[PDB]
Amino acid sequence: QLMVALRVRPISVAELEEGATLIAHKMDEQMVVLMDPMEDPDDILRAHRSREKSYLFDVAFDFTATQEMVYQATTKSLIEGVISGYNATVFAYGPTGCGKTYTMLGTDHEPGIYVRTLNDLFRAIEETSNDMEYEVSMSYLEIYNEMIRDLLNPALGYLELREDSVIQVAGITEVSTINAKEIMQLLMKGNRQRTQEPTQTSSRSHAVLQVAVRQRSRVKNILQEVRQGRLFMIDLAGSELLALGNCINALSDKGSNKYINYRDSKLTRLLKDSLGGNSRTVMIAHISPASTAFEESRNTLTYAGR
Ligand SMILES: Nc1ncnc2c1ncn2[C@@H]1O[C@H](COP(=O)(O)OP(=O)(O)O)[C@@H](O)[C@H]1O
Ligand SMILES: [Mg+2]
Known part of the structure; x- marks a missing residue:
């Protein structure tokens, strides 16, 4: 089960000084349209497409949406499954400067998905601790050029991926505090170690x-499965020698298939046991509404277009 969302951030002063206009428009609660600006001595500007194309998403947001409304529409409903043992994943995707860190971390005055999700997580946990015991840990790491760092303890240095079943970053710090000011300060400071x-x-x-969540029953005279849900909340990278071993391809391409031992990225390996059959994924694509961004916005809207 997959959901795709698109968020338009407000236009920026720097875009207005460059001379940009508005070409992205939320038309609808799940549709956005991308007007084509014009230029060049070239362009047979008549065309036939010719200047406006619409895109549809599970949900859309522009400057009218608040942080909490984005949260309610995207990740709130993941929480029940996560404490029940199901896995879930939320990506912020898009070009640099379009909103990813704002959507995921937010600011002191306007927090994002992380703390809002951690918060409903601890409420949902106490509204069910009549019947259940819970363990909650969270970690916060970087992947930079396939090198992993612990964003909450940079001193430890480069960490490796060791299997402890589940794939975990061997040695990473694990927090368990339930206060949202503390979490937010943790995540703010850890963000600056990127x-x-x-x-x-x-x-x-x-x-x-x-965020990992273990759930066991308080009724001890009946066995019951012990549950382990795993939520992943990701602020992605921005969207934007002779290697002639390419007849390698022009020769595998004869009756099919495969001839390369591809390496999985660190992020793929970390997400392997998650992102599967009975597991949910939420992508939040981000664009600028600015005309000076028209080409990246169109790449983004094409990539996320349902
Ligand atoms: N939807 C939004 N509403 C208001 N401000 C935003 C919005 N999206 C981004 N911003 C702000 O504009 C800048 C965009 O940066 P950022 O969110 O870091 O983009 P990215 O993380 O994708 O590089 C930040 O200063 C952020 O606070
Ligand atoms: Mg960022």
């Missing part, structure tokens, strides 16, 4: 917040 751009957080830094 690898920076040599010229600011690198456009190539995945931030993964994972």
